[PDB]
Amino acid sequence: KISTSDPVRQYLHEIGQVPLLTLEEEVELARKVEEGMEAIKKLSEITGLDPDLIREVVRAKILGSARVRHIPGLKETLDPKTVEEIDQKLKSLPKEHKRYLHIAREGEAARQHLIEANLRLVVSIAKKYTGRGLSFLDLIQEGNQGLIRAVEKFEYKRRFKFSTYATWWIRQAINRAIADQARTIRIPVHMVETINKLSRTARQLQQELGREPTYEEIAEAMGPGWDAKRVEETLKIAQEPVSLETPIGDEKDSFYGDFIPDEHLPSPVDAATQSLLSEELEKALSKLSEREAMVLKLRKGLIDGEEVGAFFGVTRERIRQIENKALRKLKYHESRTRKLRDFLD
Amino acid sequence: RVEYVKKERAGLRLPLAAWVEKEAYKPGEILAELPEPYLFGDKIVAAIDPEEEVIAEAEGVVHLHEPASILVVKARVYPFEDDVEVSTGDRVAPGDVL
């Protein structure tokens, strides 16, 4: 039906069935997450296998079958055979290293468990960064990605709990997202705070003048290198685009796009131009000596815009010689049979 | 499957408290741990520890609640090896194919 309510209920229901106790459960899972790492590493150590591979095989066995490996990540790990081979060596690890295997999985599990339980935390946080230009669901989701980030770095040895830790790692994720996706035309984080400061300033300036500040105040109040050109520029990028498709004129049935003209396209007038221009330029180009005419015809009209570098072996003296003597004989007979005079431009 | 335990009396629980009271994990003293009638698996003192901690110095702790979470699943302790289909479950103690 309507999307927000369903997800809210979705994770709120599961947290409702499994919130993490303040100390115990967060500590428990945390402890397991870390041992997973310590395990995977020692696993890489005795298998010679990359910690990245040991991490993806334990993930597959705990989070999903061949199905989840085949669709998400295209196909380099053989759906069945590949991952299984890896699992076999893990079994061969006697009593000592087998332990790490059993640990890695359970840790991976806790990771997931710790992640589930702390989903209300995200939503509660994400709840406040709402009207920034992102969908609540989008916001919660980015924030969610933030919590997963926190899970990777929390050190349970350092007594502080996951609550305060997740807050930061999430708030970071969200704000970034807000700055990265909110607009149609991307604007880096610095420009963003820049714009917030600009805005906040204009607010304090609105406070007493009764005059929506000329871009003079804004420069002053802002700080060190702020000038009119800078503020007019910033607020110009601050305005989001307009809907090329918006209700126009009297709102009846007016779509903002039949009125803008087109530039690349040669309006008939121009197609006729290029025809005579090229046919006449082509006639002249032929009645001349190739040596320096083509040089300047091709150097100017074929690639890019170098007198010396223009002619092949023959130096500058013959260039200027024929260039200026052929160009003038060409212009003065063209003066006789006036074809080009009526400036095609 | 129960979880954490406080300090009424300690008996039959997992390795957690083992290291705490060094008597049993340092040497074989868990039998003498039973105080005064032994003159006339886990069995600890009459009642001396009350935390979900590690005892270097009572540092890595967590005083709290003890859960009793009933898992409706069938627990197997000594499965055996029958090779008709690929070895299912487990061996006595050595091999664990599961």
Q: What is the domain extent for residue A271?
A: 266-342
Is A168 found in the same domain as A313? no
Q: What is the resolution of this structure in A?
A: 2.4
Is A138 found in the same domain as A2? yes
Is A2 found in the same domain as A131? yes
**Structure-block tokens of residue A102:** 């059993």
Q: Is residue A251 part of a domain?
A: no
3-state helix, strand, coil in chain A (%, to 5): 65, 0, 35
Is A171 found in the same domain as A203? no
Which residues in chain A have Cβ-Cβ distances shorter than 8 Å to B96? 91, 98
Is A222 found in the same domain as A137? no
Which residues in chain B have Cβ-Cβ distances shorter than 8 Å to A24? 4, 52, 62, 64-65
Q: Phi and psi (nearest 5°) for A313?
A: -95, -40
End of a domain among A240, A256, A284?
A240
Is A331 found in the same domain as A195? no
Which amino acid is present at A86?
I
Q: Is residue A256 part of a domain?
A: no
Which amino acid is present at B8?
E
Q: Which residues contact B2 (CB under 8 A, 6 or more apart)?
A: B66, B67, B68, B69
Q: What is the domain extent for residue B12?
A: 1-72
Q: Is residue A315 part of a domain?
A: yes
- C-alpha distance from residue A264 to each of A261, A268, A271, A304 (Å): 10, 12, 12, 21
Residue B11, beta-bridge partner list: B43
Say which of A23, A91, A98 has its CB closest to residue B64. A23
**Experimental method of this PDB entry:** X-ray
Is A229 found in the same domain as A143? no
Q: A24 and B97 in contact by Cβ < 8 A?
A: no
Q: A24 and B64 in contact by Cβ < 8 A?
A: yes
Is A202 found in the same domain as A173? no
Is A114 found in the same domain as A71? yes
B-proximal residues of A, 305-344, CB under 8 Å? none
Instruction: Give the span between the Cα atoms of B32 and A219, in whole angstroms.
Output: 82
Is A202 found in the same domain as A336? no
Contact B67, B78 (CB under 8 A): no
Is A92 found in the same domain as A109? yes
Contact A267, A260 (CB under 8 A): no
Three-class SS state of A255: strand
End of a domain among A166, A183, A200?
A183
Task: Specify the residue for token string 């340092």.
Answer: B26
Three-class SS state of A150: helix
Which residues in chain A have Cβ-Cβ distances shorter than 8 Å to B52? 24
Which of A189-208 are b and which e, b meaning 16 or more Cβ less than 10 Å from the residue's Cβ? eebbebbebbeebbeebeee
Instruction: Give the span between the Cα atoms of B56 and B60, in whole angstroms.
Output: 8
Q: Is residue A137 part of a domain?
A: yes
The total number of structural domains in chain A stands at 3
Q: Which CATH number do you get for residue A70?
A: 1.20.120.1810
- Contact with chain B for residue A78, Cβ under 8 A: no
Q: Is residue A176 part of a domain?
A: yes
Q: What is the 3-state secondary structure (H, E, C) of chain B?
A: CECCCCCCCCECCCCHHHHHCHHHHCCCCHHHHCCCHHHCCCECCCCCCCCCCCECCECCCCCCCCCECCCCCCCCCCCCCCCCCCCCCCCCCCCCCC
Say which of A24, A91, A98 has its CB closest to residue B62. A24
Q: Is residue A255 part of a domain?
A: no
Mutate one of B2, B6, B52, B66 to test the A interface: name it (highest A CB count within 10 A).
B52
Q: Is residue A226 part of a domain?
A: yes
Q: Which of A291, A303, A302 is nearest to A327 (CA)?
A: A291
- C-alpha distance from residue A186 to each of A113, A177, B58 (Å): 35, 11, 54
Which residues in chain A have Cβ-Cβ distances shorter than 8 Å to B93? none
Cα end-to-end span (Å), chain B? 20
For A278-342, the DSSP string reads: HHHHHHHHHSS-HHHHHHHHHHHHTS---HHHHSSSS-HHHHHHHHHHHHHHHHHHHHHTTSSSS
Instruction: Give the span between the Cα atoms of A121 and A168, in whole angstroms.
Output: 12
Where on the phi/psi map is residue A227: left (φ > 0), alpha (ψ -120 to 50), or beta?
A: beta
Is A332 found in the same domain as A310? yes
Instruction: Give the span between the Cα atoms of B33 and B10, in whole angstroms.
Output: 11
Q: Burial, A31: exposed, middle or buried (Cβ in 10 Å; 0-12, 13-18, 19+)?
A: middle
Longest dimension (CA), chain A: 104
Q: Which CATH number do you get for residue A333?
A: 1.10.10.10
Q: Is residue A254 part of a domain?
A: no
